[PDB]
Design a protein around this ligand. Structure first.
Ligand code: HEC
Length: 396
């Protein structure tokens, strides 16, 4: 409120690192819900801050294009494609990440999860993001992709390089970003070559290499889609694992409700994904002049769907700034988007988060045993809404 409406830049990454962006999004929802920003680190853009207006953008891909770039920050892959090619590639890829096709690998993830939790320090403060969230998410991706186990830290590195702003401690330049992602393409090409001329067996690289429909992708599209699948489920799962522990500590009546009725994992996991909003936005580009929420959008304009604001919109969600683990309709949220691009991995991602909560409560069943003892450090990004560290002590 101490700055002019016309000067609000909700994309400033410092607002996300400082956890001060909430107040700026609240002012826009009240006073200018479809908002033009002339000056930012990302050039000019529109902010879409209400639940119903994000739904209008998601459901009109013939007006609001995904082709070529789906973030505010300026290989082919089907998230960054419009129909018809989007729809052909999604129909090939959807069965690869469906739980119905993954039961044996998911039982192996549960065994590996239990072993990892059995190795955590007890009655000693540690960094939850390092020892649990990054550790378990990397073990899950390495299991699904049968990735060489000694090289699994490369998955975390490639994830960081894909999304990082220049000068945050990950890359020094766009030249460095391109050199590292060349390395990623070279590594995945070797795995493709080692699995295509041998009988399949049970991992996602073997499944894609032997799927007849994926012969109609170019090698560039095949590699682009393979790398989308490794990166797409990494930071999102990681920051949902961290967020749930923080939400239960900030809301002790919900931690008591969970421990008294562990079946509430079913309604809690979707509420963790809403409360966290691990990807704060997705971007579109206007293909035609259009009207949205009373504003004139021009052909070629950058249009930002702020899920971080839509998930807190009281017009759509009752008491939206409260964490409530037994809501009547807990899947009413925008963290997986909506429409033709709605997260193809959503049911697999939630299954992983339920496996983790079942295995945590098996070992530590009482309220307050998983205790946040220090402030989180947050990520410097307008896209990844997440945590670099979280000090935790397990009281057992
Ligand atoms: C194993 C893979 C994988 C996992 C795990 C995964 N995703 Fe996705 N996600 C994708 C793919 C692939 C797409 C592209 C789908 C498309 O464009 O049709 C996608 C698309 C999305 C989109 C775009 C929605 C839209 O309407 O534009 C969002 C947002 C998203 N994912 C969020 C999440 C979140 C949050 C999580 C975890 C809590 C997650 N994803 C877990 C693979 C994954």
């Amino acid at each position: 409120y101490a700055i002019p409406l016309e000067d609000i830049d909700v994309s400033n990454p410092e607002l996300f690192r400082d956890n001060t962006m909430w107040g700026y999004f609240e002012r826009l929802r009240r006073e200018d819900p479809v908002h033009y920003c002339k000056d930012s680190l990302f050039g000019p853009y529109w902010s879409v801050t209400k639940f119903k207006d994000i739904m209008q953008v998601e459901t009109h891909p013939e007006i609001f294009s995904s082709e070529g770039n789906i973030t505010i920050m300026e290989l082919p892959m089907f998230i960054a494609m419009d129909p018809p090619k989007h729809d052909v590639q999604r129909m090939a890829v959807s069965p690869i990440v469906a739980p119905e096709n993954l039961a044996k690998l998911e039982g192996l993830i549960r065994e590996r999860t239990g072993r990892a939790l059995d190795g955590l320090p007890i009655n000693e403060t540690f960094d939850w993001v390092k020892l649990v969230s990054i550790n378990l998410t990397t073990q899950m991706l390495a299991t699904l992709f049968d990735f060489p186990w000694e090289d699994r830290a490369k998955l975390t590195r490639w994830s960081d390089v894909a999304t990082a702003l220049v000068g945050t401690g990950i890359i020094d330049s766009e030249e460095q970003r391109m050199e590292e992602l060349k390395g990623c393409v070279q590594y995945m090409t070797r795995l493709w070559n080692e699995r295509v001329n041998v009988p399949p067996g049970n991992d996602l690289i073997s499944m894609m290499a032997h799927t007849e429909s994926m012969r109609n992708m170019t090698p560039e599209e095949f590699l682009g889609n393979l790398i989308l699948l490794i990166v797409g489920g990494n930071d999102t799962t990681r920051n949902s694992m961290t967020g749930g522990v923080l939400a239960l500590n900030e809301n002790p009546d919900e931690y008591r409700k969970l421990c008294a009725n562990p079946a509430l994992i079913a309604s809690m996991v979707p509420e963790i994904v809403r409360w966290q909003t691990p990807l704060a936005h997705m971007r579109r580009t206007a293909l035609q002049d259009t009207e949205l929420g009373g504003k004139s959008i021009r052909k070629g304009d950058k249009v930002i769907m702020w899920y971080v604001s839509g998930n807190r919109d009281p017009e759509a969600i009752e008491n939206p700034d409260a964490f409530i683990i037994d809501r009547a309709k807990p899947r009413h949220h925008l963290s997986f988007g909506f429409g033709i691009h709605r997260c193809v991995g959503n049911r697999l991602a939630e299954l992983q988060l339920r496996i983790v909560w079942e295995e945590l409560l098996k070992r530590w069943p009482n309220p307050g045993q998983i205790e946040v003892v220090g402030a989180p450090e947050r990520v410097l990004s307008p896209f990844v809404k997440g945590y670099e560290s979280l000090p935790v002590r397990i009281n057992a």
